[PDB]
mmCIF file of C-alpha atoms (C1' of nucleotides) and ligand atoms in Angstrom:
data_model
loop_
_atom_site.group_PDB
_atom_site.id
_atom_site.type_symbol
_atom_site.label_atom_id
_atom_site.label_comp_id
_atom_site.label_asym_id
_atom_site.label_seq_id
_atom_site.Cartn_x
_atom_site.Cartn_y
_atom_site.Cartn_z
ATOM 1 C CA UNK V 23 0.000 0.000 0.000
ATOM 2 C CA UNK V 24 1.056 3.635 0.294
ATOM 3 C CA UNK V 25 3.946 3.703 2.779
ATOM 4 C CA UNK V 26 3.537 7.450 2.419
ATOM 5 C CA UNK V 27 -0.132 6.835 3.186
ATOM 6 C CA UNK V 28 0.468 5.058 6.440
ATOM 7 C CA UNK V 29 -1.199 7.287 9.037
ATOM 8 C CA UNK V 30 -0.825 6.875 12.809
ATOM 9 C CA UNK V 31 -4.114 6.707 14.659
ATOM 10 C CA UNK V 32 -4.971 10.332 15.533
ATOM 11 C CA UNK V 33 -4.323 10.627 19.177
ATOM 12 C CA UNK V 34 -1.713 8.134 20.256
ATOM 13 C CA UNK V 35 1.278 10.256 19.208
ATOM 14 C CA UNK V 36 1.532 13.608 21.014
ATOM 15 C CA UNK V 37 4.433 16.063 20.883
ATOM 16 C CA UNK V 38 6.969 16.596 23.637
ATOM 17 C CA UNK V 39 7.186 19.695 25.769
ATOM 18 C CA UNK V 40 10.071 21.730 24.341
ATOM 19 C CA UNK V 41 10.642 24.002 27.257
ATOM 20 C CA UNK V 42 12.974 26.990 26.873
ATOM 21 C CA UNK V 43 12.456 28.323 23.415
ATOM 22 C CA UNK V 44 10.511 31.514 23.267
ATOM 23 C CA UNK V 45 7.824 33.820 24.582
ATOM 24 C CA UNK V 46 5.445 31.930 22.377
ATOM 25 C CA UNK V 47 4.825 29.667 25.318
ATOM 26 C CA UNK V 48 6.632 28.768 28.537
ATOM 27 C CA UNK V 49 9.385 31.408 28.256
ATOM 28 C CA UNK V 50 12.269 32.500 30.533
ATOM 29 C CA UNK V 51 11.612 30.407 33.578
ATOM 30 C CA UNK V 52 10.638 27.035 32.200
ATOM 31 C CA UNK V 53 7.382 26.543 34.048
ATOM 32 C CA UNK V 54 9.041 27.046 37.441
ATOM 33 C CA UNK V 55 8.076 30.501 38.641
ATOM 34 C CA UNK V 56 11.273 32.283 39.908
ATOM 35 C CA UNK V 57 12.057 30.193 42.940
ATOM 36 C CA UNK V 58 14.226 27.997 45.114
ATOM 37 C CA UNK V 59 13.605 25.737 42.075
ATOM 38 C CA UNK V 60 16.992 24.974 40.613
ATOM 39 C CA UNK V 61 18.628 22.003 38.940
ATOM 40 C CA UNK V 62 19.899 19.284 41.281
ATOM 41 C CA UNK V 63 16.515 18.052 42.560
ATOM 42 C CA UNK V 64 16.203 16.704 46.132
ATOM 43 C CA UNK V 65 13.157 15.125 47.964
ATOM 44 C CA UNK V 66 9.796 13.398 47.390
ATOM 45 C CA UNK V 67 8.173 12.175 50.614
ATOM 46 C CA UNK V 68 9.658 14.717 53.023
ATOM 47 C CA UNK V 69 8.975 17.749 55.145
ATOM 48 C CA UNK V 70 10.655 18.378 58.536
ATOM 49 C CA UNK V 71 8.139 17.435 61.274
ATOM 50 C CA UNK V 72 7.671 14.450 59.312
ATOM 51 C CA UNK V 73 4.150 13.290 60.304
ATOM 52 C CA UNK V 74 4.294 9.899 58.681
ATOM 53 C CA UNK V 75 5.702 9.741 62.238
ATOM 54 C CA UNK V 76 2.762 7.826 63.836
ATOM 55 C CA UNK V 77 3.586 4.547 65.637
ATOM 56 C CA UNK V 78 3.824 0.969 64.391
ATOM 57 C CA UNK V 79 2.439 -2.473 65.346
ATOM 58 C CA UNK V 80 4.456 -5.164 63.719
ATOM 59 C CA UNK V 81 4.387 -8.737 62.477
ATOM 60 C CA UNK V 82 6.972 -10.117 60.049
ATOM 61 C CA UNK V 83 5.444 -13.161 58.182
ATOM 62 C CA UNK V 84 2.467 -14.112 56.028
ATOM 63 C CA UNK V 85 1.163 -17.034 53.942
ATOM 64 C CA UNK V 86 -1.994 -17.429 51.883
ATOM 65 C CA UNK V 87 -4.039 -19.608 49.559
ATOM 66 C CA UNK V 88 -4.906 -19.476 45.858
ATOM 67 C CA UNK V 89 -8.608 -18.613 45.594
ATOM 68 C CA UNK V 90 -11.255 -20.577 43.665
ATOM 69 C CA UNK V 91 -14.771 -19.190 44.037
ATOM 70 C "C1'" U K 11 16.878 29.475 29.864
ATOM 71 C "C1'" U K 12 15.903 30.705 22.291
ATOM 72 C "C1'" C K 13 9.714 29.412 17.039
ATOM 73 C "C1'" U K 14 4.172 31.218 16.600
ATOM 74 C "C1'" C K 15 -1.060 32.116 17.300
ATOM 75 C "C1'" C K 16 -5.717 30.496 20.369
ATOM 76 C "C1'" C K 17 -8.436 29.576 25.652
ATOM 77 C "C1'" C K 18 -8.576 30.031 30.625
ATOM 78 C "C1'" G K 19 -5.699 32.500 34.828
ATOM 79 C "C1'" A K 20 -3.716 33.044 39.851
ATOM 80 C "C1'" A K 21 -0.613 33.912 44.868
ATOM 81 C "C1'" A K 22 1.997 37.309 48.044
ATOM 82 C "C1'" U K 23 -3.299 34.415 53.055
ATOM 83 C "C1'" G K 24 -3.671 30.184 57.200
ATOM 84 C "C1'" U K 25 -1.155 26.548 60.296
ATOM 85 C "C1'" A K 26 3.629 24.024 60.865
ATOM 86 C "C1'" U K 27 8.736 24.230 60.594
ATOM 87 C "C1'" U K 28 17.095 24.866 64.056
ATOM 88 C "C1'" G K 29 11.520 27.940 60.511
ATOM 89 C "C1'" A K 30 11.510 33.292 58.740
ATOM 90 C "C1'" G K 31 14.205 35.450 50.806
ATOM 91 C "C1'" G K 32 13.436 27.749 52.027
ATOM 92 C "C1'" U K 33 9.854 23.895 52.414
ATOM 93 C "C1'" A K 34 4.841 20.423 53.741
ATOM 94 C "C1'" C K 35 -0.789 20.880 53.898
ATOM 95 C "C1'" A K 36 -4.652 23.816 52.982
ATOM 96 C "C1'" G K 37 -6.391 28.161 50.206
ATOM 97 C "C1'" C K 38 -6.705 30.564 45.253
ATOM 98 C "C1'" C K 39 -5.344 28.672 38.854
ATOM 99 C "C1'" U K 40 -5.901 25.228 34.828
ATOM 100 C "C1'" C K 41 -7.284 20.450 32.273
ATOM 101 C "C1'" G K 42 -10.396 15.820 31.660
ATOM 102 C "C1'" G K 43 -14.661 12.937 33.812
ATOM 103 C "C1'" A K 44 -19.290 12.873 36.809
ATOM 104 C "C1'" U K 45 -23.754 15.286 38.607
ATOM 105 C "C1'" G K 46 -26.272 17.847 36.575
ATOM 106 C "C1'" U K 47 -28.958 23.660 39.180
ATOM 107 C "C1'" U K 48 -27.438 22.278 44.218
ATOM 108 C "C1'" G K 49 -23.895 28.343 42.532
ATOM 109 C "C1'" A K 50 -24.694 34.252 42.398
ATOM 110 C "C1'" C K 51 -27.674 38.280 43.483
ATOM 111 C "C1'" C K 52 -31.976 40.397 45.633
ATOM 112 C "C1'" A K 53 -36.922 39.535 48.676
ATOM 113 C "C1'" U K 54 -39.872 37.450 52.764
ATOM 114 C "C1'" G K 55 -39.707 34.357 57.372
ATOM 115 C "C1'" U K 56 -37.123 33.025 61.206
ATOM 116 C "C1'" C K 57 -33.214 32.821 64.757
ATOM 117 C "C1'" C K 58 -27.986 34.715 66.838
ATOM 118 C "C1'" U K 59 -24.876 39.218 68.340
ATOM 119 C "C1'" G K 60 -23.310 43.566 72.284
ATOM 120 C "C1'" U K 61 -20.327 47.321 68.123
ATOM 121 C "C1'" A K 62 -22.083 52.978 67.006
ATOM 122 C "C1'" G K 63 -24.861 55.630 70.068
ATOM 123 C "C1'" A K 64 -26.587 56.286 75.017
ATOM 124 C "C1'" G K 65 -26.708 55.622 80.415
ATOM 125 C "C1'" C K 66 -24.886 55.391 85.558
ATOM 126 C "C1'" A K 67 -28.490 50.199 87.694
ATOM 127 C "C1'" C K 68 -23.067 47.484 89.235
ATOM 128 C "C1'" U K 69 -16.753 48.129 89.182
ATOM 129 C "C1'" C K 70 -13.116 52.144 88.849
ATOM 130 C "C1'" A K 71 -12.691 57.361 88.246
ATOM 131 C "C1'" C K 72 -14.787 62.031 89.200
ATOM 132 C "C1'" A K 73 -17.209 68.034 89.849
ATOM 133 C "C1'" A K 74 -20.421 71.857 93.584
ATOM 134 C "C1'" G K 75 -23.368 71.620 97.842
ATOM 135 C "C1'" G K 76 -26.446 68.990 102.321
ATOM 136 C "C1'" C K 77 -26.513 65.627 106.671
ATOM 137 C "C1'" U K 78 -22.680 63.584 109.633
ATOM 138 C "C1'" A K 79 -17.822 60.955 114.894
HETATM 139 MG MG1 MG R 101 2.005 25.375 25.669
HETATM 140 MG MG1 MG R 102 15.550 34.135 37.210
HETATM 141 MG MG1 MG R 103 23.929 20.682 39.435
HETATM 142 MG MG1 MG R 104 -9.937 36.867 30.738
HETATM 143 MG MG1 MG R 105 -0.209 25.012 66.543
HETATM 144 MG MG1 MG R 106 8.003 31.913 54.262
HETATM 145 MG MG1 MG R 107 0.083 22.825 47.108
HETATM 146 MG MG1 MG R 108 -14.110 21.015 34.815
HETATM 147 MG MG1 MG R 109 -25.034 24.529 47.161
HETATM 148 MG MG1 MG R 110 -30.435 28.810 44.801
HETATM 149 MG MG1 MG R 111 -19.033 54.891 73.248
#
RNA sequence: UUCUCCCCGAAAUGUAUUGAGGUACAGCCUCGGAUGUUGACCAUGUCCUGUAGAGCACUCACAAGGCUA
């Protein structure tokens, strides 16, 4: 058939965010707002009072059956 | 921190922080889905309040006389 007339399903393919690159969209700061937002990123489940700091009740093992309703 | 036009559009508040020009959560923005008038204004009904004013009935302050250990 027409290898030139292969067409990807509309949708599916979508273009990448090219970030820097102009006051036509997402200019100077690259979607980042003028901040203490700077390259070498550091943290993901942390603030400093942590509060995932509730207490624990603990067993080690487990074992279980395959189910056949 | 570099190419274009189109649509919407904020925050500089709260609480926490060896925290205070940083950060977490919330708040406020946008997008898609769901409901689908529950939103907005203004009206009537109803309930709550101690400010403006005022007043000395209590507390404190206080002006001229009277009576008076
Ligand atoms: Mg864009
Ligand atoms: Mg800068
Ligand atoms: Mg670096
Ligand atoms: Mg507009
Ligand atoms: Mg507190
Ligand atoms: Mg701060
Ligand atoms: Mg947030
Ligand atoms: Mg929506
Ligand atoms: Mg409603
Ligand atoms: Mg209504
Ligand atoms: Mg008054």
